[PDB]
């Protein structure tokens, strides 16, 4: 069978494996981990890696592995299952799901009318002590990688230095949401699905929160694309290509619509969970996935004192 380095969620991917194996008989072994962990591990393994497939929550760790020259071209028929805007132009990997940046806020701490117009506005001195984020996570680092691609090094580093003055750090994006929910800060920068996931359980970590979408092609409207790819070293290329085709195809994208992950489908003509605000109404900035640079992001955040 095939070996998948999986930095996407264990439960979502297991439902993909369930349908994929049922229809093809191809068995899948998951090696689960985080974006940056598994990305760096693949670069170190190089062509000696036992992985056939790499899946990520966000794009920068895909770019890391592609920069190392480790991905095989994806089948053209697979690439055509996803629109070009949710896909690197070079076709060596593909988007498999999406997540929207949001400002999660506590209405008892901050009225909707007081929310920042731009993610860049959180650098202003009036925001000191009033917002949070998880800078060690690949989630927030991907958001900063979009700001870097959109705004450039100097403007991004200036924003990061003001964030060091202004923000409150927490370990984990769900932790940020819990802190907002408890009223420790006015709000925080996370991805949209965390609130949906918790509301589908007890809601005890989210009931005092609401989601704000920056829109207007703001850096804060960045839509982060989860990635999938076939390793060039794979000895099971047909099976590996078929797994990517499955997860980006109608049945695989269907799971995104009906499961409890609340992440967006990216497939052509694919409906997303109806509780989500449609991606086409969010007016995300144009951000080429290959332009997202996780190494420079870590350096800038370290220069700012955040890591
Ligand atoms: Fe995440």
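^ structure tokens above, recovered residues below v
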């Amino acid at each position: 069978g095939i070996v998948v380095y999986n930095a996407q969620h264990e439960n979502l991917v297991k439902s993909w494996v369930d349908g994929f194996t049922k229809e093809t008989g191809i068995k899948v072994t998951l090696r689960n981990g985080d974006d940056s962990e598994l990305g760096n591990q693949l670069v170190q393994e190089g062509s000696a890696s036992p992985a056939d497939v790499f899946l990520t929550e966000n794009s920068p760790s895909m770019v890391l592995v592609d920069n190392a020259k480790l991905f095989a071209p994806l089948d053209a028929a697979t690439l055509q299952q996803v629109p070009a805007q949710y896909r690197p132009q070079h076709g060596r990997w593909i988007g498999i799901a999406a997540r929207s940046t949001v400002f999660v806020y506590n209405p008892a701490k901050i009225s909707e009318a007081q929310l920042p117009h731009s993610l860049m506005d959180l650098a202003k001195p009036e925001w000191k002590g009033r917002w949070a984020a998880s800078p060690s996570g690949a989630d927030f680092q991907a958001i900063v990688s979009a700001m870097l691609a959109l705004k450039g090094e100097q403007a991004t580093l200036d924003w990061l230095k003001a964030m060091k003055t202004n923000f409150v750090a927490y370990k984990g994006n769900s932790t940020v949401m819990k802190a907002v929910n408890a009223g420790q800060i006015d709000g925080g920068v996370i991805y949209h699905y965390y609130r949906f996931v918790d509301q589908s359980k007890t809601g005890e970590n989210s009931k005092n929160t609401q989601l704000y979408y920056f829109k207007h092609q703001d850096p804060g409207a960045f839509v982060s694309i989860s990635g999938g790819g076939v390793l060039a070293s794979s000895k099971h290329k047909a099976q590996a290509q078929a797994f990517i085709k499955w997860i980006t195809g109608k049945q695989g994208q269907d799971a995104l619509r009906t499961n409890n992950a609340f992440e967006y489908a990216v497939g052509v003509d694919a409906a997303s969970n109806p509780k989500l605000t449609p991606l086409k109404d969010l007016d995300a900035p144009k951000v080429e996935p290959s332009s997202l640079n996780s190494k420079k992001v870590i350096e800038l955040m370290t220069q700012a004192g955040l890591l």
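The longest strand covers residues 94-105.
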